[PDB]
């Protein structure tokens, strides 16, 4: 939330002090999470290694 550069806003209002938040889940639950993403979310690459003499 930029007031000098409003071009890059990505949220309705600023997160002021004293705002109420919450955490999704349970105290000590464990699970296997499902995943959904886009093609350009994260990238993976393998660096080739050099030969030795």
């Amino acid at each position: 939330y930029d007031t000098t550069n409003p071009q890059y806003n990505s949220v309705s209002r600023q997160v002021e002090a004293g705002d109420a938040v919450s955490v999704v889940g349970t105290a000590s639950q464990t699970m296997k999470p499902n995943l959904f993403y886009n093609k350009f979310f994260c990238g993976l690459g393998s660096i080739p290694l050099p030969k030795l003499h």
Binding site: P48, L49, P50, K51
Partner: protein, 148 residues
């Protein structure tokens, strides 16, 4: 035997006969604390041009004492003492002599010959690697890494 601070100051005072063990007239301790402060400042300055020689600066906020351990090697004693004497003689309205200057220069050269490095120049990074080195096509070994 550790080379504590103030021993260098005593050596510098002795080598110009300002004060020593055999002197009937001695110098007040204010001069000694001024000398140790001058030594501290001189080492702080030496942290730039000659380099780092393992000097143990006082930590926290307490002032340097004339009895704490300096941590310097024994081999640097004459060099440090002569430099301190050169930077300190003018305090007593005195002028140096040619033999003292020659001794200081020789000791400084002996100290400086230890810190010599002579860096080596690596490859440009665009220099081709000879095909006889048997590089790998896809591992970007055809050229030198250069730096970083």
């Amino acid at each position: 035997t550790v080379l504590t601070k103030g021993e260098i100051v005593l050596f510098a005072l002795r080598k110009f006969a300002i004060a020593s063990n055999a002197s009937l007239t001695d110098v007040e301790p204010q001069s000694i604390e001024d000398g140790v402060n001058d030594l501290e400042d001189m080492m702080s300055e030496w942290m730039i041009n000659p380099g780092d020689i393992g000097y143990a600066f006082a930590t926290g906020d307490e002032q340097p004492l004339p009895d704490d351990e300096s941590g310097l090697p024994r081999k640097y004693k004459h060099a440090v003492g002569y430099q301190l004497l050169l930077r300190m003689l003018s305090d007593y309205s005195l002028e140096p002599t040619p033999q003292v200057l020659s001794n200081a220069q020789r000791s400084y050269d002996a100290l400086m010959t230890d810190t010599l490095v002579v860096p080596s120049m690596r490859r440009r990074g665009d220099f081709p690697v000879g095909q006889g080195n048997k590089y790998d096509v896809f591992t970007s070994d055809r050229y030198y890494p250069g730096d970083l």
